[PDB]
Design a protein around this ligand. Sequence first.
Ligand SMILES: *CCC(=O)N1CCN2c3ncnc4cc(-c5c(C)ccc6n[nH]cc56)c(Cl)c(c34)OCC[C@H]2C1
Ligand SMILES: Nc1nc2c(ncn2[C@@H]2O[C@H](COP(=O)(O)OP(=O)(O)O)[C@@H](O)[C@H]2O)c(=O)[nH]1
Ligand SMILES: [Mg+2]
Length: 168
Amino acid sequence: GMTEYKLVVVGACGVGKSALTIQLIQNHFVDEYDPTIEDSYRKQVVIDGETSLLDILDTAGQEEYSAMRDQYMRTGEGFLLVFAINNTKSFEDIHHYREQIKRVKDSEDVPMVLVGNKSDLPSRTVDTKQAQDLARSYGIPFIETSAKTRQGVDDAFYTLVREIRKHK
Ligand SMILES: *CCC(=O)N1CCN2c3ncnc4cc(-c5c(C)ccc6n[nH]cc56)c(Cl)c(c34)OCC[C@H]2C1
Ligand SMILES: Nc1nc2c(ncn2[C@@H]2O[C@H](COP(=O)(O)OP(=O)(O)O)[C@@H](O)[C@H]2O)c(=O)[nH]1
Ligand SMILES: [Mg+2]
């Protein structure tokens, strides 16, 4: 019946991949979620008045290449590129995450959203403009989020489904 989209949440350790996903699915903020737990969650959502089944993979584990990570990138239809706005290293790591998805999908136009997480925190080291300029250069949306307050959480995932729908 309804369309199903495979979403993948990527980004450096500690940016809030797990916190963002569990806020979307279960409507609470996790303070300390085990960094090895990689699991997928299913949720029906209405976006722009059309229902879709989202199947969301929250990535975890070691800094390693694997043919299996290549696989869930290959099956993934859209990617959240998550950094934390208080962690410049996580922002500098976005290039790596995009390159490895671009490697396995052989496209610079795969549906993606840049997510600047932890927007509730005062000591920002990455400004709106620097993230907007990065997303513009990539040809993707930028969304500021807080897993803690829920600000922008739905918008990040919904915006990615909007990007997958335009793609064909
Ligand atoms: C605190 C744990 C955690 O969340 N992470 C640390 C290990 N990660 C990680 N580190 C470096 N490079 C990663 C690359 C990929 C990757 C992509 C994006 C695409 C295809 C592919 N094929 N082999 C690896 C990859 C992934 Cl999937 C990583 C990477 O995931 C593990 C979680 C990530 C963050
Ligand atoms: N203040 C704040 N802390 C967050 C936010 N998102 C995640 N955290 C915290 O940052 C840490 C890492 O989050 P986690 O979701 O485990 O990161 P992951 O390794 O990307 O899954 C945890 O302590 C979270 O509670 C956020 O939006 N705001
Ligand atoms: Mg996690």
